[PDB]
Write an enzyme that holds these catalytic residues in place. Structure first.
Site, PDB file in Angstrom:
ATOM      1  N   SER A   1       0.796  -1.224   0.000  1.00  0.00           N
ATOM      2  CA  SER A   1       0.000   0.000   0.000  1.00  0.00           C
ATOM      3  C   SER A   1       0.832   1.279   0.000  1.00  0.00           C
ATOM      4  O   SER A   1       0.250   2.348  -0.188  1.00  0.00           O
ATOM      5  CB  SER A   1      -0.946   0.022   1.194  1.00  0.00           C
TER       6      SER A   1
ATOM      7  N   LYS B   1       0.152   3.305  -2.975  1.00  0.00           N
ATOM      8  CA  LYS B   1      -0.957   4.242  -3.122  1.00  0.00           C
ATOM      9  C   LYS B   1      -0.463   5.658  -3.363  1.00  0.00           C
ATOM     10  O   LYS B   1      -1.224   6.475  -3.895  1.00  0.00           O
ATOM     11  CB  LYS B   1      -1.874   4.152  -1.902  1.00  0.00           C
TER      12      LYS B   1
ATOM     13  N   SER C   1      -6.381   2.799   3.876  1.00  0.00           N
ATOM     14  CA  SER C   1      -5.646   1.942   2.951  1.00  0.00           C
ATOM     15  C   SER C   1      -6.579   0.995   2.179  1.00  0.00           C
ATOM     16  O   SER C   1      -6.453  -0.239   2.209  1.00  0.00           O
ATOM     17  CB  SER C   1      -4.557   1.169   3.702  1.00  0.00           C
TER      18      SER C   1
ATOM     19  N   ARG D   1       5.792  -0.388  13.068  1.00  0.00           N
ATOM     20  CA  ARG D   1       6.220   0.425  11.933  1.00  0.00           C
ATOM     21  C   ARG D   1       6.394   1.877  12.363  1.00  0.00           C
ATOM     22  O   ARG D   1       7.456   2.487  12.161  1.00  0.00           O
ATOM     23  CB  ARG D   1       5.205   0.306  10.781  1.00  0.00           C
TER      24      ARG D   1
HETATM   25 CL   LIG Z   1      -3.571  -0.430  -2.793  1.00  0.00          CL
END
Ligand SMILES: [Cl-]
Ligand SMILES: [Cl-]
Ligand SMILES: [Cl-]
Lengths: 242, 243
Positions: B48, B51, B96, B228
């Site tokens: 993601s 994106k 997301s 993260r």
């Molecule tokens: Cl995506």
């Protein structure tokens, strides 16, 4: 329509304060205030004027972008954060008056006046010193008029370029987290009575936007933190933020 | 660009029983730092984090008109409850929402997607695989240092798309902001092809400097997803970048 919520007066009286908060639910097109009378009372904008001033300077090309450096002129002024280089982001954050006074000088009275009328900004009056009319001159705006102005800015409906409006909304960024984004600007009018504090802006949620404008009597600078704290009490009471 | 290894930063992974890399770039000094130079240059599926380029392309091709245009839910009830509703660009990035971006990719098409990723110099520029899933299980690969190089161009509005698209995507990357700093970033979680990993890439805006960052870490279970951000913030605090 608007709606008086007298119960909201608790958030001012419990801090021994006097003021108004205006809230506008953008989805429902409905407004709320603790006092309709003060919500329409006009005051000097003080540093909340940095929002339209920024827009005009960008539109006219006085400011090229949000990271262009405005070099300190080397004149030692009374506020140490002003005595250094700034860009549009930090000039807004640190409410750097001399940077914005120079914007006004470059814009000039004729264009300043015409743009405020195009914005429908308060009484649209620039009487007084070109470099200080928003602190001790003739311009006046109410809390409900701040909201009306901010909604146009939020929707890119002012008649400057879309880019100029996006840059200013960037420069208004005050707080962001996984629950909300606040874009806003404080103000503190001290040069003439009554001394007042402002906070105007909006709260972006996943599925709605809530515009706000508050002012309050500010006899001493000791209460400036209440501008944001009273506003946040109201937002939490209304479940707009956690 | 110009990187320097700081093996002592490995403790930020090992004390959490984690394994990964963090890359930090000081924009004013044009200087980079990482706990591990080899892994910093190892390319992974972007998941993601894709994106970010996908948004730019979709905006510049008019697949997306602006950041509040509504992408109606397609009526499929997927495993992540936040996906099962209408979205705009802001909320599709925040939650997301993969299926929104799979539809962007189908509208963009292979030829334009490939041309644009070459224009961006994005990773290995390889779109082999399914048009609507190659960043999850196709051929595209990008390293942590490459993520930073890409993000620096976006920060400076230097990518080969309109300035407006770059400003909108940077708005849609907004993650945290306060009186000390602003973080614009994007998480990723690559689960389809081994090794499964997590990502966080973006930058920290300060009054007088910008610190770009890209981290990835092994993610064999979803239990460690919060590391993260937490490991990145540990490094940022130790370096006095944020309080
Ligand atoms: Cl995506
Ligand atoms: Cl007045
Ligand atoms: Cl000012």
């Amino acid at each position: 329509e608007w709606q008086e919520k007298p119960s909201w007066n608790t958030h001012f009286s419990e801090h021994k304060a006097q003021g108004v908060i205006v809230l506008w639910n953008e989805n429902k097109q409905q407004g709320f205030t603790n006092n309709l009378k003060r919500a329409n009372q006009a005051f000097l904008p003080a540093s909340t004027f940095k929002i339209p001033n920024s827009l005009i300077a960008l539109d006219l090309g006085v400011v090229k972008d949000e990271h262009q450096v405005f070099k300190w002129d080397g004149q030692t002024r009374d506020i140490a954060a002003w005595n250094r280089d700034h860009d549009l982001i930090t000039a807004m954050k640190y409410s750097v008056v001399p940077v914005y006074q120079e914007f006004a000088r470059q814009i000039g009275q004729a264009r300043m006046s015409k743009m405020l009328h195009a914005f429908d900004y308060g009484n649209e009056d620039i009487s007084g010193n070109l470099d200080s009319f928003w602190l001790d001159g003739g311009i006046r705006i109410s809390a409900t008029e701040q909201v009306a102005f901010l909604r146009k800015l939020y929707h890119n409906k002012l008649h400057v370029s879309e880019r100029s409006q996006r840059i200013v909304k960037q420069a208004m960024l005050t707080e962001a987290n996984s629950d909300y984004i606040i874009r806003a600007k404080t103000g503190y009018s001290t040069r003439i009575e009554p001394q007042i504090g402002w906070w105007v802006g909006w709260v972006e949620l996943d599925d709605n936007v809530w515009f706000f404008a508050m002012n309050m009597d500010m006899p001493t600078a000791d209460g400036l933190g209440l501008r944001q704290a009273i506003t946040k009490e109201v937002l939490k009471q209304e479940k707009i933020i956690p």
